[PDB]
Symmetry: C3
Subunit: 71 residues, 3 copies
Amino acid sequence: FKSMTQEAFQESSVKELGRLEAQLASLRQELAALTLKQNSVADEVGLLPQKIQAARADVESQFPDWIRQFL
Amino acid sequence: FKSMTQEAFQESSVKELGRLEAQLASLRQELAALTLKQNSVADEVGLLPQKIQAARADVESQFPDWIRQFLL
Amino acid sequence: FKSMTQEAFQESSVKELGRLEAQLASLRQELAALTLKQNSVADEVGLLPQKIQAARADVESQF
Protein backbone atom coordinates (compact mmCIF):
# COMPACT_ATOMS: atom_id res chain seq x y z
CA PHE A 1 0.00 0.00 0.00
CA LYS A 2 1.15 3.51 -0.92
CA SER A 3 0.50 6.29 1.58
CA MET A 4 0.27 9.97 0.65
CA THR A 5 1.38 12.91 2.78
CA GLN A 6 -1.19 14.10 5.34
CA GLU A 7 -1.93 17.16 3.22
CA ALA A 8 -2.43 15.18 -0.01
CA PHE A 9 -4.73 12.70 1.71
CA GLN A 10 -6.71 15.55 3.28
CA GLU A 11 -7.27 17.04 -0.16
CA SER A 12 -8.03 13.80 -1.99
CA SER A 13 -10.30 12.16 0.61
CA VAL A 14 -12.37 15.32 1.08
CA LYS A 15 -12.94 15.63 -2.66
CA GLU A 16 -13.90 11.94 -3.01
CA LEU A 17 -16.32 12.18 -0.05
CA GLY A 18 -17.89 15.25 -1.67
CA ARG A 19 -18.31 13.35 -4.94
CA LEU A 20 -20.13 10.54 -3.16
CA GLU A 21 -22.28 13.05 -1.27
CA ALA A 22 -23.36 14.73 -4.53
CA GLN A 23 -24.16 11.33 -6.02
CA LEU A 24 -26.28 10.50 -2.98
CA ALA A 25 -28.20 13.79 -3.34
CA SER A 26 -28.92 13.06 -7.01
CA LEU A 27 -30.16 9.57 -6.07
CA ARG A 28 -32.40 10.84 -3.23
CA GLN A 29 -34.02 13.28 -5.63
CA GLU A 30 -34.61 10.52 -8.20
CA LEU A 31 -36.33 8.43 -5.53
CA ALA A 32 -38.50 11.43 -4.65
CA ALA A 33 -39.38 12.01 -8.31
CA LEU A 34 -40.34 8.36 -8.72
CA THR A 35 -42.63 8.48 -5.65
CA LEU A 36 -44.39 11.44 -7.26
CA LYS A 37 -44.93 9.53 -10.54
CA GLN A 38 -46.14 6.54 -8.52
CA ASN A 39 -48.82 8.52 -6.64
CA SER A 40 -50.03 10.14 -9.84
CA VAL A 41 -50.43 6.67 -11.42
CA ALA A 42 -52.23 5.35 -8.33
CA ASP A 43 -54.63 8.32 -8.57
CA GLU A 44 -55.41 7.40 -12.21
CA VAL A 45 -55.97 3.76 -11.26
CA GLY A 46 -58.29 4.79 -8.43
CA LEU A 47 -60.49 6.66 -10.92
CA LEU A 48 -60.83 3.82 -13.44
CA PRO A 49 -63.90 2.08 -11.91
CA GLN A 50 -65.74 5.41 -12.01
CA LYS A 51 -64.84 5.70 -15.69
CA ILE A 52 -66.15 2.24 -16.57
CA GLN A 53 -69.54 2.87 -14.95
CA ALA A 54 -69.99 6.17 -16.79
CA ALA A 55 -69.49 4.46 -20.15
CA ARG A 56 -71.53 1.47 -18.97
CA ALA A 57 -74.41 3.78 -18.08
CA ASP A 58 -73.77 5.90 -21.18
CA VAL A 59 -74.32 2.92 -23.49
CA GLU A 60 -77.71 1.92 -22.07
CA SER A 61 -79.03 5.46 -22.52
CA GLN A 62 -78.17 5.47 -26.22
CA PHE A 63 -79.84 2.08 -26.63
CA PRO A 64 -83.44 2.89 -27.72
CA ASP A 65 -81.94 5.43 -30.10
CA TRP A 66 -79.77 2.64 -31.53
CA ILE A 67 -82.82 0.59 -32.50
CA ARG A 68 -84.29 3.71 -34.10
CA GLN A 69 -81.09 4.39 -36.08
CA PHE A 70 -81.12 0.75 -37.17
CA LEU A 71 -84.47 0.89 -39.00
CA PHE B 1 2.30 21.23 23.63
CA LYS B 2 0.40 18.48 21.83
CA SER B 3 -0.78 19.10 18.27
CA MET B 4 -4.39 18.10 17.62
CA THR B 5 -4.92 18.50 13.86
CA GLN B 6 -4.03 14.97 12.78
CA GLU B 7 -6.28 13.28 15.33
CA ALA B 8 -9.09 15.73 14.65
CA PHE B 9 -8.95 14.98 10.93
CA GLN B 10 -9.08 11.23 11.61
CA GLU B 11 -12.18 11.86 13.74
CA SER B 12 -14.01 14.07 11.25
CA SER B 13 -13.15 11.68 8.40
CA VAL B 14 -14.75 8.63 10.04
CA LYS B 15 -17.73 10.75 11.11
CA GLU B 16 -18.32 11.94 7.53
CA LEU B 17 -17.97 8.39 6.18
CA GLY B 18 -20.59 7.46 8.76
CA ARG B 19 -22.88 10.32 7.80
CA LEU B 20 -22.87 9.23 4.14
CA GLU B 21 -23.22 5.55 5.07
CA ALA B 22 -26.40 6.51 6.95
CA GLN B 23 -27.75 8.33 3.89
CA LEU B 24 -27.09 5.15 1.89
CA ALA B 25 -29.06 3.10 4.43
CA SER B 26 -32.01 5.52 4.22
CA LEU B 27 -31.94 5.48 0.40
CA ARG B 28 -31.78 1.68 0.27
CA GLN B 29 -34.73 1.48 2.66
CA GLU B 30 -36.70 3.94 0.53
CA LEU B 31 -35.92 1.95 -2.62
CA ALA B 32 -37.23 -1.19 -0.88
CA ALA B 33 -40.42 0.72 0.01
CA LEU B 34 -40.90 1.93 -3.58
CA THR B 35 -40.35 -1.61 -4.84
CA LEU B 36 -43.04 -2.93 -2.52
CA LYS B 37 -45.50 -0.22 -3.56
CA GLN B 38 -44.76 -0.82 -7.25
CA ASN B 39 -45.48 -4.54 -6.94
CA SER B 40 -48.73 -3.72 -5.16
CA VAL B 41 -49.93 -1.35 -7.90
CA ALA B 42 -48.71 -3.75 -10.58
CA ASP B 43 -50.89 -6.53 -9.14
CA GLU B 44 -53.85 -4.15 -9.16
CA VAL B 45 -53.21 -3.03 -12.74
CA GLY B 46 -53.05 -6.72 -13.68
CA LEU B 47 -56.77 -7.12 -12.91
CA LEU B 48 -57.88 -4.12 -14.99
CA PRO B 49 -58.09 -5.76 -18.42
CA GLN B 50 -60.40 -8.34 -16.84
CA LYS B 51 -62.40 -5.49 -15.30
CA ILE B 52 -63.12 -3.92 -18.69
CA GLN B 53 -63.98 -7.27 -20.27
CA ALA B 54 -66.36 -8.04 -17.40
CA ALA B 55 -68.18 -4.78 -18.12
CA ARG B 56 -68.14 -5.34 -21.88
CA ALA B 57 -69.77 -8.77 -21.62
CA ASP B 58 -72.21 -7.83 -18.86
CA VAL B 59 -73.73 -5.13 -21.03
CA GLU B 60 -73.81 -7.84 -23.70
CA SER B 61 -75.93 -9.90 -21.29
CA GLN B 62 -78.59 -7.28 -20.52
CA PHE B 63 -80.04 -7.00 -24.03
CA PRO B 64 -82.73 -9.72 -23.99
CA ASP B 65 -84.39 -8.22 -20.92
CA TRP B 66 -83.89 -4.75 -22.36
CA ILE B 67 -85.30 -5.37 -25.85
CA ARG B 68 -88.36 -7.22 -24.51
CA GLN B 69 -89.13 -4.16 -22.40
CA PHE B 70 -88.58 -1.74 -25.29
CA LEU B 71 -90.95 -3.66 -27.56
CA LEU B 72 -93.42 -3.96 -24.67
CA PHE C 1 10.81 1.76 14.30
CA LYS C 2 8.30 2.76 11.62
CA SER C 3 5.01 4.20 12.90
CA MET C 4 1.97 2.80 11.11
CA THR C 5 -1.14 4.61 12.38
CA GLN C 6 -1.23 7.11 9.50
CA GLU C 7 -0.79 4.51 6.77
CA ALA C 8 -3.30 2.15 8.37
CA PHE C 9 -5.79 5.01 8.71
CA GLN C 10 -5.33 5.96 5.05
CA GLU C 11 -5.74 2.40 3.81
CA SER C 12 -8.84 1.71 5.92
CA SER C 13 -10.53 5.01 5.04
CA VAL C 14 -9.94 4.49 1.32
CA LYS C 15 -11.27 0.95 1.59
CA GLU C 16 -14.32 2.07 3.60
CA LEU C 17 -15.14 4.75 1.02
CA GLY C 18 -14.87 1.99 -1.56
CA ARG C 19 -17.41 -0.06 0.38
CA LEU C 20 -19.88 2.86 0.38
CA GLU C 21 -19.27 3.52 -3.32
CA ALA C 22 -20.16 -0.11 -4.11
CA GLN C 23 -23.38 0.27 -2.11
CA LEU C 24 -24.23 3.27 -4.29
CA ALA C 25 -23.61 1.37 -7.55
CA SER C 26 -25.92 -1.41 -6.35
CA LEU C 27 -28.69 1.16 -5.65
CA ARG C 28 -28.35 2.85 -9.03
CA GLN C 29 -28.62 -0.51 -10.81
CA GLU C 30 -31.74 -1.42 -8.83
CA LEU C 31 -33.35 2.00 -9.29
CA ALA C 32 -32.70 1.84 -13.06
CA ALA C 33 -34.63 -1.44 -13.26
CA LEU C 34 -37.45 -0.05 -11.12
CA THR C 35 -37.76 3.16 -13.15
CA LEU C 36 -38.36 1.12 -16.33
CA LYS C 37 -40.97 -1.04 -14.58
CA GLN C 38 -42.76 2.02 -13.25
CA ASN C 39 -42.64 3.75 -16.65
CA SER C 40 -44.18 0.66 -18.24
CA VAL C 41 -47.07 0.61 -15.76
CA ALA C 42 -47.59 4.35 -16.20
CA ASP C 43 -47.72 3.83 -19.97
CA GLU C 44 -50.38 1.09 -19.71
CA VAL C 45 -52.56 3.01 -17.24
CA GLY C 46 -52.28 6.09 -19.44
CA LEU C 47 -53.84 4.17 -22.35
CA LEU C 48 -56.71 2.64 -20.35
CA PRO C 49 -59.20 5.50 -20.97
CA GLN C 50 -58.68 4.91 -24.70
CA LYS C 51 -59.42 1.21 -24.21
CA ILE C 52 -62.66 2.02 -22.36
CA GLN C 53 -63.81 4.19 -25.27
CA ALA C 54 -62.90 1.36 -27.64
CA ALA C 55 -65.11 -0.99 -25.63
CA ARG C 56 -68.10 1.34 -25.82
CA ALA C 57 -67.59 1.97 -29.54
CA ASP C 58 -67.42 -1.79 -30.10
CA VAL C 59 -70.73 -2.31 -28.30
CA GLU C 60 -72.39 0.26 -30.56
CA SER C 61 -70.83 -1.33 -33.66
CA GLN C 62 -71.34 -4.99 -32.79
CA PHE C 63 -75.16 -5.04 -32.70
